[PDB]
Amino acid sequence: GHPTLKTPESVTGTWKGDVKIQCIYDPLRGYRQVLVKWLVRHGSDSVTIFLRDSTGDHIQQAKYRGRLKVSHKVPGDVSLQINTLQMDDRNHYTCEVTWQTPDGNQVIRDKIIELRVRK
Incomplete structure (x- = not known):
């Protein structure tokens, strides 16, 4: 039995507000998380x-630096928070x-979440 990622099918955030896209799993005994994307x-x-890896959190695109935060304190919670939602943030988001x-x-698990942006 490998871990199960629990995610919403879709999430709606408010334009220029903040939103969290949940992705949580219960850590399994003896499994080591090695990458999050x-x-x-x-x-x-x-x-x-x-990307989160052994050297920490990486946000390469300028347009996201300062706007994206992935949960880190609770093991198994790798939820994505987006600050100041843009209309162009409407998309399908994958957590891997x-x-x-x-x-x-x-072993790799992933899920897809639709993000809608409402005014």
Whole structure:
């Protein structure tokens, strides 16, 4: 049994407000989380907007630096918070988590959440 990511199907945030896109799992004994990514679609191809790895949290795109926060205090909660929602933030967001397992494999789970932006 590998972990289960629990996510909403869709979330609506308020334009120029803040929103959280939940992604939570119950940590399984002896599983080590090794990577977290959040992605969006950008015309058919995906793009990474956030990465957490052994060197911390990485937001490479200027337009997101200072606007994105991924939960870090509670194990298993990798929810994405977006500050000052733009109309162009409407998208499908993917959260991808990788673990190393007790048997020494690396396994990946992901989920897709639609974000709508309402005025």
